[PDB]
Design goal:
- Chain B: This is Spike protein S2'.
- The structure is cut from a larger assembly and holds two copies of chain A.
- With 46 residues, chain A is mostly loops.
- Chain A has one helix and no strands.
- Chain A is globular, with a radius of gyration of 11 Å.
- The first copy, chain A, starts with 20 loop residues before the first helix and ends in a 22-residue tail after the last helix.
- The interface between A and B is small, with 3 and 3 residues.
Chain lengths: 46, 49
């Protein structure tokens, strides 16, 4: 799953943690297993 | 105390069950003894442990 989010949400995408877009569009599982990666794509959209 | 033995059998069984049921109240280290509260005031990930 690939999307772009802001820097202050990187700590919101975590197993068992609540947020908004991972709660209002698609949601992560409590038993999730995998990994997440983050790129600072500031010069893409600003 | 002529009937000590039979009386003793009865008492042992009664006491065993009593302690078994009473031990449900112990917390064993958990934050509470009733499961409902455990599952109420805590998120599922921590309620597991």
């Amino acid at each position: 799953d690939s999307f772009v989010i802001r820097g202050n949400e990187v700590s919101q995408i975590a197993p068992g943690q609540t947020g908004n877009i991972a709660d209002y569009n698609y949601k992560l599982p409590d038993d999730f297993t995998g990994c997440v990666i983050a790129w600072n794509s500031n010069k893409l959209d600003s | 105390s002529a009937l000590g033995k039979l009386q003793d059998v009865v008492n042992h069984n009664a006491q065993a069950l009593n302690t078994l049921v009473k031990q449900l109240s112990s917390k064993f280290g958990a934050i509470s003894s009733v499961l409902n509260d455990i599952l109420s005031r805590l998120d599922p990930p921590e309620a597991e442990v």
